[PDB]
Design a binder for this molecule. Sequence first.
Ligand SMILES: CC(=O)NCCc1cn2cccc(C)c2n1
Lengths: 300, 237
Amino acid sequence: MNTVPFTSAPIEVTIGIDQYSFNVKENQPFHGIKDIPIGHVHVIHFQHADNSSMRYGYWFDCRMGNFYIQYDPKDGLYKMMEERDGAKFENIVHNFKERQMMVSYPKIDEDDTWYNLTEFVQMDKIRKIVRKDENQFSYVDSSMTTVQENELSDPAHSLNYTVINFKSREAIRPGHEMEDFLDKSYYLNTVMLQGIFKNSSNYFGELQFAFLNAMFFGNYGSSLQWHAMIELICSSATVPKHMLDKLDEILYYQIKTLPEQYSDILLNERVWNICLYSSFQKNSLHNTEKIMENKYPELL
Amino acid sequence: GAMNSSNYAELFNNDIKLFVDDTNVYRVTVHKTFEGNVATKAINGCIFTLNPKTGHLFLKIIHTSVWAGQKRLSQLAKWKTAEEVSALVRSLPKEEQPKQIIVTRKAMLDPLEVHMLDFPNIAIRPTELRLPFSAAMSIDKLSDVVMKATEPQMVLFNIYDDWLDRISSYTAFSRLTLLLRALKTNEESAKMILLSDPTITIKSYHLWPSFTDEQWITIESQMRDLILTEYGRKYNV
Ligand SMILES: CC(=O)NCCc1cn2cccc(C)c2n1
């Protein structure tokens, strides 16, 4: 059980850890989060009480280092940092644990939600989408634009998602124009799976990471990425059977977890209706279609 | 962006552009089978690709053999249209290639955009105009070469005949669309109107009769009457 301790809480803020969140008052004696499950990536995120603009946060894996959160009054935000002195960090964590100034990661034992949302998400892949190689953790916020968004302006602060574009030479073989545009199996299986991602796990990992950034930060480019990666599978007539079954589970848990009140901005009507009702895979996502019809029958 | 009433004059500037109409690509007759079911028989069609500034028409004849053993022919027809348009552009010298291609039906946008990926600088545009190019098969010489074809064939015409010797391309295009609009609303009447006097012969190398300026003015007026009338006969006014 690992710990992300906090130096202090000088400004009022709503702090999230994965799908949980709590309110911290200005100068409240808050000193971090303990009992964080080992074996998954995690995200710790922030919304200041004064400026609900800019949600921001940090993707991390406690196996890769000892991390602490400290508020910077010059840059005006909570910053994640690495403590390279392990004795000093364990000692600071033990002090805080003894004074009971930490909240406990509040996981119900029956609950596999976070595992199901991050099954294929790897810290090493996150660090290639979010390039800042001198840190072992990755910063994301509501306003960061994606590489593909930049093409259509500071590249150091970009989300380097894999570019998917259905009307592109990468997607369309000369002489197979109609075939490749109406059935994207070539693009999915040869270009993306075999060529860029190498395997379906890496594809699903980027899909899941894009969704989580869309949900937790309202990052529009990430939502675009999530839908495009769904649509590419659903618009392919030939998909490995194990991928379709796994996709149905992935989407089920994403739709289950989405805040009911945010469905209007985060769910693209055209893509979901195409995917559930028109596409080749219209009959292959039974769990996702049942939860979508029972939870968001308006969108459909 | 879309082509409409408001940017109409762009059609006659010095930027090469083509209209593409696919209405007459996939043509069928519907009939009863001996069992009493219904079936279709394809007939020859054509792509109508027109430079509105010069009058140059690239009439690609679509032979029925191209549909043999194919499914979803109305969908295929749009992709075949885009394939042939792309091939036409690729066949032209660079300085003759269009800067824009305007499709008369929105369903052609994605097929043509995908076939033209090699030409990122050629803009593919829809239009808000309801142009009457479907009536091109009411022009006797065009209908004749389409129906006689025994294999795929491209035929080149100037749909303005020699009009640009005397009038501008704006005026020529307006005359063409009036004639075609009339033929589409009442083909019999429209065609009668061309032949009311029969001394005004069609030259062998032309599509329309050899009217004087003064006789065109009369013709054009009579086609506007026809269209109004049919609009009454149809809507009752
Ligand atoms: C000691 C010092 O310079 N403290 C000031 C900031 C600070 C360093 N930190 C290292 C590990 C854990 C925590 C909360 C932490 N806080």
